[PDB]
Design a protein around this ligand. Structure first.
Ligand SMILES: CCC[C@@H]1C[C@@H](C(=O)N[C@@H]([C@H]2O[C@H](SC)[C@H](O)[C@@H](O)[C@H]2O)[C@@H](C)O)N(C)C1
Ligand SMILES: [K+]
Ligand SMILES: [Mg+2]
Ligand SMILES: [Mg+2]
Ligand SMILES: [Mg+2]
Ligand SMILES: [Mg+2]
Ligand SMILES: [Mg+2]
Ligand SMILES: [Mg+2]
Ligand SMILES: [Mg+2]
Ligand SMILES: [Mg+2]
Ligand SMILES: [Mg+2]
Ligand SMILES: [Mg+2]
Ligand SMILES: [Mg+2]
Ligand SMILES: [Mg+2]
Ligand SMILES: [Mg+2]
Ligand SMILES: [Mg+2]
Ligand SMILES: [Mg+2]
Ligand SMILES: [Mg+2]
Ligand SMILES: [Mg+2]
Ligand SMILES: [Mg+2]
Ligand SMILES: [Mg+2]
Ligand SMILES: [Mg+2]
Ligand SMILES: [Mg+2]
Ligand SMILES: [Mg+2]
Ligand SMILES: [Mg+2]
Ligand SMILES: [Mg+2]
Ligand SMILES: [Mg+2]
Ligand SMILES: [Mg+2]
Ligand SMILES: [Mg+2]
Ligand SMILES: [Mg+2]
Ligand SMILES: [Mg+2]
Ligand SMILES: [Mg+2]
Ligand SMILES: [Mg+2]
Ligand SMILES: [Mg+2]
Ligand SMILES: [Mg+2]
Ligand SMILES: [Mg+2]
Lengths: 133, 73, 56
RNA sequence: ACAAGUAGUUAGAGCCCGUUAAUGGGUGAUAGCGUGCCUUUUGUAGAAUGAACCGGCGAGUUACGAUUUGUUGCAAGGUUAA
RNA sequence: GUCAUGGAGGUAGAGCACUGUUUGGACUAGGGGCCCUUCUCGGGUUACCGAAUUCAGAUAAACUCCGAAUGCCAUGUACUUAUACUCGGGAGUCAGACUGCGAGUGAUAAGAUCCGUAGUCGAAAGGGAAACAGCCCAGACCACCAGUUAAGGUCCCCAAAUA
RNA sequence: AAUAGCUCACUGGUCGAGUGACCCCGCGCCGAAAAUGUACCGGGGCUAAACAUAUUACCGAAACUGUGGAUGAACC
RNA sequence: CUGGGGCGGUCGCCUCCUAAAGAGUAACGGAGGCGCCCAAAGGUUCCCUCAGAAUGGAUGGAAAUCAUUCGCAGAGUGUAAAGGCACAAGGGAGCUUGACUGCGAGACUGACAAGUCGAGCAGGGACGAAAGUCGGGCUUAGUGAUCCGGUGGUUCCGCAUGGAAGGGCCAUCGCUCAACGGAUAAAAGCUACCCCGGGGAUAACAGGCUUAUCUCCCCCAAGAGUCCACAUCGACGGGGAGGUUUGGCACCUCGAUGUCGGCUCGUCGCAUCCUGGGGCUGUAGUCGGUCCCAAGGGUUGGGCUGUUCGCCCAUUAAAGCGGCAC
RNA sequence: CUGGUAGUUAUGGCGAGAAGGUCACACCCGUUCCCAUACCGAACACGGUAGUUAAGCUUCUCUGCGCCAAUGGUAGUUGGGGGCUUCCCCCUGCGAGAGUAGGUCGCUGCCGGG
């Protein structure tokens, strides 16, 4: 997951105060993985979590990713002093605020849903709750 | 490659609603008409609104979306 | 009619609060002042309620 | 001569004195509190600087102009220079 | 300084009306796979691609149909308070520090760096935090073998509850 | 080796009262390895002398007050 | 200027974000523009409305020019961006030169120098029937002081007098003086042969903070392992600890904190190399693997290189890894 | 009742449906004259009134779109406090945006004709 293009290559880190403004109630699916605390989710983590979910479902049911990594983040190499302008874009993140449903699944029985979602949760840097519609 | 910016131009209201002004007092500095010349108010070449007579400044709604400033003796 | 007593120090307090305590007419800690109960005075007290004690 | 000390200070027995006569002097068991002075610093007990100690010597002056305040004399005048 | 009244201003939040980013579904013009006379012109094919269209759902420092708290400017015949301004004489200062809050840079590192805002230190002794410029409480004119409180405390070191 | 042995999805007997999931909150447990010496409450030590909620006494500053004194300004 | 200096980049002006809903506000923070242009792209009077799509139609194609419909603006506005603009500030046409001279109450901005706006008055005009508008352009960049020179004007001065020379005043021209408040009319390097004044205001060593990186330890378990995730390995991802690495910062020390390796002397940690005890094993035995307890003692001599490190020879029960100003 | 001309944040707009007309107002008829088209009497301008309410206009109906909009709650936040802190919690005051109950097919002048 990467934006096809961006207006600006470099972007403020932002903050993650408050409950997610949208996407707090499960919408397209039966079961959802809900962020309990805030965190940046990288595109690498979304993929690791997606494949874990989907593999356990064995190409059965549907998987909605409800977060998208819109925000770039930069880094400076090792051995580089402070200053001389902002670093090069390194990766893509989705700032997830508490209460945001990150993944939704349908078309599998509860037991399989609840297992696929715990397998996904173990790839994410954020405390999660499983919630059902 | 960045590191540039122009001098800040000190735009915005220069006299308060309900304040007495003398003729020629600049009321609002602006690019374009954020606020329109009301009664006894002129619009200068750079869109500066100035009192044409002495009196009291009143910022008023024009209609729904627009705003004007007037000077009432 | 209110009796206002300055109970906390102004050291470490912002200027607005200090200026209000001054306008109430309070000086040193444990200074007392007697004021007519108006909205003007009530409003001052509200700004510095954490610094003063108020009786009747 | 069982003590851990910027050396005093506050409390204080004991012992020894006796004054510019004072709610006095010397010493100080013991107890509390307590990181010199100066310079330079955001910040120095400083493991930053300077001084071994004592003594002497050792740093905003004068002249001529400017300006301002004070004072005094005279006042639409005042004042002389060589 | 507060109260009342009026006003400028687009932040927080929110929203998706615009611009960008974006998910799923339905729809549907093309293009690309597959055979046919064929010039693959067009059919019969299609989840190999794909531009609009809508339905639902997200997202933003440089998005806004909206929009606070505060702060700001002013008015008053309001209540308190005690300064403002002008003109002269004399300065010093132009290495700041940390803490809290709001931002950037950084790695949402630094006792980092750079602004904004408040405080303390600087130039502030006293009490607390063992010790501890910058934290908590609080401002030392002098004397007293008087009293009441603050933070912090009350078994012993160690004043106060083995409440 | 396969067959059987045991043990059993399934029971009527006993013996007989509770027993099994799931969610939330409080306080704890593991995860937890560094270099001179205990050494991550200042110490002693504490099972409260810890924590939560409520309550009240007291201690505690050069704060404020009391008594005496010195002094600046403004006013009369 | 500079997260030491050099190298690189930058230096003035405009627009936006940063900027915390007045104004202002920093960084070698995030993005773009300017050093002009226009005789109309200025003034005024009158009239007008754009983008795109659908449908139909010769050349004619996805797209040229017609026509109808829908279309608040999805266009345009000389040029960046922001704020404005559809009574248009956008688009036509007619006449024009106000892209005027003297000014200017009063305001904004502001250390100063400068910069900005301005009703209104007078002169004389343009357009308009008039009302009226007009001192350039929708607004905000498009510029540079003084001194010195040049040119034009001039009811100014003219060193005894008349003149003149020369000066003054008004107008205007001549500089990337762009390091853009411009040291001069006129200016590059090397120093390990160096010197003085200073600074821990500022680098090289070590300490400190930080821990990205590094080392170690974990979580999840796709898998590998005939079968079997977990004997042993363990992808994609996730969480820590340590403070030995490579780094960041610049807080102590520049009126000196000697800096690599070795020698001598060790001492400490345990994340254990050997020896001791133990669990699991894909442990028959002999050997091993892996984990747990354990820091008592022990832990070699040579070849090469200044080396540390490393490779090699020969041993050994073993030839541990780290800290102590490496 | 209708023509003209104003004010008022669209509660006033859009869309849909219906009715109406010699008194206006329209369309409408004509290009001789003033005056017009970068071609076009389409428009503008001038002169008419045979025809027509079809359209504009006027009145009436409706909530499909828009617009307006409470209360309550929530976010945020001034001030005051706490934490375990990418952040979160408590007290006091202020208090959205969204959503909603609801509202709206306007209202208020002056002049001429009837
Ligand atoms: C990478 C080095 C870092 C610096 C070293 C040190 C220093 O200056 N050392 C001096 C020494 O010279 C003599 S030893 C020959 C002196 O005896 C000794 O005391 C001392 O001054 C000299 C070697 O340069 N600094 C404090 C930091
Ligand atoms: K997790
Ligand atoms: Mg600026
Ligand atoms: Mg102009
Ligand atoms: Mg305080
Ligand atoms: Mg003794
Ligand atoms: Mg002893
Ligand atoms: Mg010395
Ligand atoms: Mg003098
Ligand atoms: Mg926001
Ligand atoms: Mg925004
Ligand atoms: Mg601060
Ligand atoms: Mg700092
Ligand atoms: Mg100082
Ligand atoms: Mg102090
Ligand atoms: Mg102490
Ligand atoms: Mg000090
Ligand atoms: Mg006391
Ligand atoms: Mg007491
Ligand atoms: Mg006691
Ligand atoms: Mg006192
Ligand atoms: Mg640095
Ligand atoms: Mg550097
Ligand atoms: Mg602002
Ligand atoms: Mg000359
Ligand atoms: Mg002559
Ligand atoms: Mg300069
Ligand atoms: Mg040589
Ligand atoms: Mg330093
Ligand atoms: Mg170092
Ligand atoms: Mg050191
Ligand atoms: Mg610094
Ligand atoms: Mg020395
Ligand atoms: Mg061990
Ligand atoms: Mg050798
Ligand atoms: Mg060494």
């Amino acid at each position: 997951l990467v934006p096809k293009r961006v207006k600006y290559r470099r972007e403020f880190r932002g903050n993650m105060r408050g409950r997610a403004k949208g996407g707090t109630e499960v919408a397209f699916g039966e079961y959802g993985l809900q962020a309990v605390e805030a965190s940046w989710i990288t595109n690498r983590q979304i993929e690791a979590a997606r494949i874990a979910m989907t593999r356990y479902m064995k190409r059965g049911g549907k998987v909605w990713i409800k977060i998208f990594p819109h925000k770039s983040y930069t880094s400076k190499p090792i051995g580089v002093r402070m200053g001389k302008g902002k670093g090069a874009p390194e990766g893509w993140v989705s700032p997830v605020k508490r209460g945001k449903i990150m993944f939704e699944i349908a078309g599998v029985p509860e037991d399989v849903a609840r297992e696929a979602l715990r397998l996904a949760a173990h790839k994410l840097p954020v405390k999660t709750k499983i919630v059902k519609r | 490659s960045n590191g540039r910016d122009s001098e800040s131009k000190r735009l915005g209201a220069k006299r308060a609603d309900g304040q007495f002004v003398t003729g020629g007092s600049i009321l609002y500095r602006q690019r374009g008409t954020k606020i329109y010349p009301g009664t006894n108010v002129g619009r200068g070449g750079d869109d500066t609104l100035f009192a044409k007579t002495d009196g009291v400044v009143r910022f008023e709604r024009m209609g729904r979306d627009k705003k004007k400033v007037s000077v009432y003796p | 009619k209110l009796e206002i007593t300055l109970k906390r120090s102004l050291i470490g307090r912002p200027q607005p609060q200090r200026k209000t305590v001054q306008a109430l007419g309070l000086g040193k800690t444990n200074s007392v002042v007697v004021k007519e109960d108006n909205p003007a005075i009530r409003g001052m007290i509200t700004k510095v309620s954490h610094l003063v004690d108020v009786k009747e």
